[PDB]
RNA sequence: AAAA
């Protein structure tokens, strides 16, 4: 069900500290145990790098005894029922380190220089690839099977913690880390910091960036709820005014813009362009002020506790500026044609290349409505349709196939007695790709060049 | 252009140690300096937490003097060409970390034996949000205006390092980390591990997962090249036997499956389903064996250096198993309709809902071809078209609108003398979403229920 | 704050 994963470090350098989270204190010498008592996950998994403990039979059993040895030192009540419950799973490491030479699952001892000390087998040298370490931790997470993943990033090497964070990200883990000062001591009430929001904020930004790149709103993570809930407890004059502007950013108009583009509502997408231009012009202003605020963060201490205003979400939204152009609605539609081409939306690109010359034609004749009852449209459409069938036979063929899809007269499939269908034509993946990406612009530009003379 | 970023720690417990990267060798007391003369970047940014030091005038100048104070104790032999060109930028922190006092241009300190002990500030308490820290670091990265980002995750608090890693990810940074593992005692040759590949492998998996989720091949990160260029020099009989299978996984058939689905080649997508079923049935077998290999990684040390085989890339690909179903091509197309609905591909869902009942009808009559010359098709199409226009007027309307898009008779826009277009029907995002997500399946099931009696 |  709920599993706590933690990467192990050298316990001989641990002291009793009073870890804190929301006021619910936990007195221990390692953060993993504190988080166990707080969250109380059903399964606890500690990853121990081969860099640490080493023995003749079981390194996992030596680590279990190493922790109870530092529980017998400093006189701690726990580690008997706890370490018995913990599932110890060994992981690979890289670089040079010092391991411990245990006798028989019990770490050994030998007095060197000052007095009794663990005889560390100082040389350990292994060259491993971080993705080998990644694959080792991944397999543990995957086959472990949990409904809720909890990852402790407090203890362990910076290499293993970063690797563990990226594994956890693929299992929708909650991340925790409890950083402390160099040997604090008694009554050290250090805070456990949750990092879940930070890993989500970066995933959200990469998704927002790709959403504008591939003209898809399904990838745009809507931060409407975050901004609407955002409120300054204490606001210090013009740190209240700029937040008012940010809270009022129409992120819904951006999502709708991407929806219309994706779904082929080309006239609506283009009509929204000037509104969007004013949305991101304000967003540019807001972000410069917010950037300046966080660059001189010492003066805007009021934002120190805020979790709803994330700079990357807003900065990633500024990319939508690339989807915008200045000019008449025909020039805006012409730009959109190029956008569909780059984004590999073959269907929408071909339909726009077919219909835009009719509108171009209509404009030349003084205007009209896309309706069969309109004489100007009737003749304008007849001209572009017949000119396309006369010269650009390929354009018109790809258009109708993409428009009607597989189950259609355009593809001529055959349905049998058994309920099985055999395609009637070949789906030319690279020919469609090639035509749109290499000739649709050159062809369109020639069609519109001809229709200018009209 | 190329610029290095590092987060700072207490220079107090730092010893002069040699480093290693691509065979390069460099001796210093902190990894950031080693990486500086290894790569030689145009700018170097020193991110210093507010818990690190505290001066009456400039905390950045005290850190600048703190590092030269530690350089003096033993032979630093440097900082006359690295201490000039480094931009010190203060960052916020969290917790009860103990700060260290500063006065004008000096860090003070007192003897109290052991030579001259560090003047610990002793108590500091700040409760900040990790996204506030994230926004602070983001603003620094964003406004630094760099072409190539390089991030050092060796030094600093585990909270600040993980936060820095997620910021770096949004700037396409290369990540490096060199942990010590114990008492160095000079030299030791601590190795700097690059983590770029690990952060990319997880981003790639999230993209692969979303690609299957939204039926889009543009998001699927192709790992064919990795797989082909993968061959360990020494390989066991059981290792080779299963790696041979992995190297032969037809990831191209999965990408093509997603291409046909996105572009509406529904018959072809459905025909590929059985082939795909075998592709994933083997990939499951290989994943169980590889998972077992990485779970018992101590026996398969041949993989210890491999960077091409990423478990997450293959495991994420297994999600395509959800896109598959058993049954005749009509039953497979029926399932695909539900897939288009869940994926919010309104155009493809409505065209399939319109054409699938014609095929259903054709099957009942013993089969036929989707062609106007076929009598069975002619009548079958006439029946579903008239039944849809009779009972499901809405379905037929949304279908043609989405099929022809904005510039069409289906939307009736009006073109001006000025070249500006005013939409005709302005059909909303919600009316379309609600209809297909809430009614399309119930309506389709009733259409097919009726056509069974045929 | 290079196995808090």
Author numbering:
A (entry chain A), B (entry chain B): 1 to 454
The authors write:
SisCsx1, as other members of the Csm6/Csx1 family, is composed of an N-terminal CRISPR-Cas-associated Rossmann Fold (CARF) domain connected to an α-helical higher eukaryotes and prokaryotes nucleotide-binding (HEPN) domain by a helix-turn-helix (HTH) domain. The SisCsx1 monomers are curled around the two-fold axis to form a dimer, and three of these dimers oligomerize through their HEPN domains into an equilateral trimer, thus assembling into a hexamer. Each dimer contains a cOA4 binding site at the vertex of the triangular assembly, and a catalytic pocket located 70 Å away inside the triangular oligomer along the two-fold dimer axis. We show that cOA4 binding activates a cooperative sequential catalytic response in a hexameric SisCsx1 complex and that the RNase activity is switched-off by Ring nucleases, which cleave cOA423.
The Cα backbone built in this map was later combined with an iodine derivative of a better diffracting crystal of SisCsx1 in the space group I212121 to determine the structure of the apo SisCsx1 to 2.9 Å. Subsequently the apo SisCsx1 structure was used two determine by molecular replacement two SisCsx1 conformations in complex with cOA4 at 3.1 and 2.7 Å resolution respectively, thus providing the molecular details of the RNase activation by the secondary messenger. To explore these differences, we crystallized the SisCsx1-cOA4 complex by soaking the compound in crystals of the apo SisCsx1 at 25 °C, and we also co-crystallized the complex after heating up the mixture of cOA4 with the isolated SisCsx1 to monitor possible conformational changes that could elicit the RNase activity by the presence of cOA4. We synthesized cOA4 using purified Type III-B SisCmr−α complex, and observed that the binding of cOA4 at room temperature, barely activates SisCsx1, while heating the reaction mixture triggered full RNase activity. The phosphate inversion in cOA4 is stabilized in both cases by hydrogen bonds of the phosphate groups of A1 and A3 with N158 and N158′ through a water molecule. A rotamer change of H155 in both monomers allows the polar interaction of the imidazole group with the A2 and A4 bases in each monomer, thus positioning the cyclic compound into the cruciform pocket. In addition, A2 and A4 phosphates are stabilized by the side chains of Y14 and Y14′. Finally, the anti conformation of A2 and A4 is stabilized by interactions of the base with the main chain of S15, S15′, F29′, and V180′ and the OH of Y19′, while the syn configurations observed for A1 and A3 are stabilized by polar interactions with the main chain of D10, D10′, S51, S51′, and S98 and hydrophobic contacts with M181 side chain in both monomers.
